[PDB]
């Protein structure tokens, strides 16, 4: 029983230095976090300016590090020497990265409802994550019957989403999957003519 | 504008496994290979645009190891509680017969960062052209991981991503077949 061997207990220590950016680099917040197992125990927050204990386990470390004035000076300036530095290192291929979605429309292999056509809009390969995928019937946005997978991260600097619509396809009806995404100034559209 | 860059590290005992990586809005910029002692860029072009001195990561890892030992003793040897993963299998894009595609095994919401992943083709382990990411950080301090299998879609092959983890009593087995 157990899906893998070597069940000795484990002990885990994580350190995270988070640089949070608002309006470009107009505002910056550095958050250093120390986590033992699954419990954060002490942090430095640049909006605070000193180490603080999150749990009891972290109290000696806050006390020790707050006694080190060089260290506090260094951390207090890291919003500049670290966050804004690293922001500028990578801005052109991270912040500025724009990869256009590929959009395809097709009938589901599953057609559960007689006289209905279940349609699928596949939106893939795009960057960054912010996107809107919507269905239109003729000139009207469909506000009912739509189902979305929401945003899916692929782990490789691309995303995808899948949006389905049950249609009662009449003659002369045109169904359009329409995508708004920061990589394009005009929406992407792919149409299905019933 | 809203963006977050995270330098995330860890050390795990008794495995003696370290990790150091940078994350931008949830995607990995790079990590350091602790065996080769070298920077590994998540996309190849990143290494043409930027640099990172791997010895800084290795020095941090030594300190992380020392701090883990202290914290292990300080907590009276309180071990991590296993949190088993959630596993989803999807493809990179809509699947068409005989059009190369990629199967993604997404492993989420687990700790500690040790997990075993096997791709099975028609029930048999397959190694051809597989790749994987390091452990990726989550705000709840659990982890995420991706495994990839390029494949040529057919009606005759089925696939499973098999995931094992100390928090699972039995292997998770997540299936994919061509939607015929």
């Amino acid at each position: 029983m157990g899906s893998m061997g070597d069940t000795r207990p484990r002990f885990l220590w994580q350190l995270k230095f988070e640089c949070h950016f608002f309006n470009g680099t107009e505002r910056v917040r550095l958050l250093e976090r120390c986590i033992y197992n699954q419990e954060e125990s002490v942090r430095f927050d640049s909006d605070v300016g000193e180490y603080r204990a999150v749990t009891e386990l972290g109290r000696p470390d806050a006390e020790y590090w707050n006694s080190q004035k060089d260290l506090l000076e260094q951390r207090r300036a890291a919003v500049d020497t670290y966050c804004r530095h690293n922001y500028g290192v990578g801005e052109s291929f991270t912040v500025q990265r724009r990869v256009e979605p590929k959009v395809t429309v097709y009938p589901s292999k599953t057609q559960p409802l007689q006289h209905h056509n279940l349609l699928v809009c596949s939106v893939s390969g795009f960057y960054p994550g912010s996107i809107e995928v919507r269905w239109f019937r003729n000139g009207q946005e469909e506000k009912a019957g739509v189902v979305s997978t929401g945003l899916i991260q692929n782990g490789d600097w691309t995303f995808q989403t899948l949006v389905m619509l049950e249609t009662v396809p009449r003659s002369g009806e045109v169904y359009t999957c329409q995508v708004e995404h920061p990589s394009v100034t005009s929406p992407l559209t792919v149409e299905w003519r019933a | 504008e809203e963006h977050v860059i995270i330098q995330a590290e860890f050390y795990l005992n008794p495995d003696q496994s370290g990790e150091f990586m940078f994350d931008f809005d949830g995607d990995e910029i790079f990590h350091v290979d602790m065996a080769k002692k070298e920077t590994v860029w998540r996309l190849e072009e990143f290494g043409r645009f930027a640099s990172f001195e791997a010895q800084g990561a290795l020095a941090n890892i030594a300190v992380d190891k020392a701090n883990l030992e202290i914290m292990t003793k300080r907590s009276n040897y309180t071990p991590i509680t296993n949190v088993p993963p959630e596993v989803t299998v999807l493809t990179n894009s809509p699947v068409e017969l005989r059009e190369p595609n990629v199967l993604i095994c997404f492993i989420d919401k687990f700790t500690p960062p040790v997990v075993n992943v096997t791709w099975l083709r028609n029930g048999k382990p397959v190694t051809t052209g597989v790749s994987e990411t390091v452990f990726l950080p989550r705000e709840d301090h659990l982890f995420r991981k991706f495994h990839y299998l390029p494949f040529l879609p057919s009606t005759e092959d089925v696939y499973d991503c098999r995931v094992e983890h100390w928090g699972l009593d039995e292997p998770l087995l997540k299936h994919w077949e061509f939607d015929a």
């Binding site: 000696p60 260290l71 690293n86 | 300190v63 701090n67």
Partner: peptide, 14 residues
């Protein structure tokens, strides 16, 4: 060079 800089981890009190 165009260099990512790490923040250095510091030890607990010995």
């Amino acid at each position: 060079f165009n260099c990512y800089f790490p923040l250095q981890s510091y030890g607990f009190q010995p």
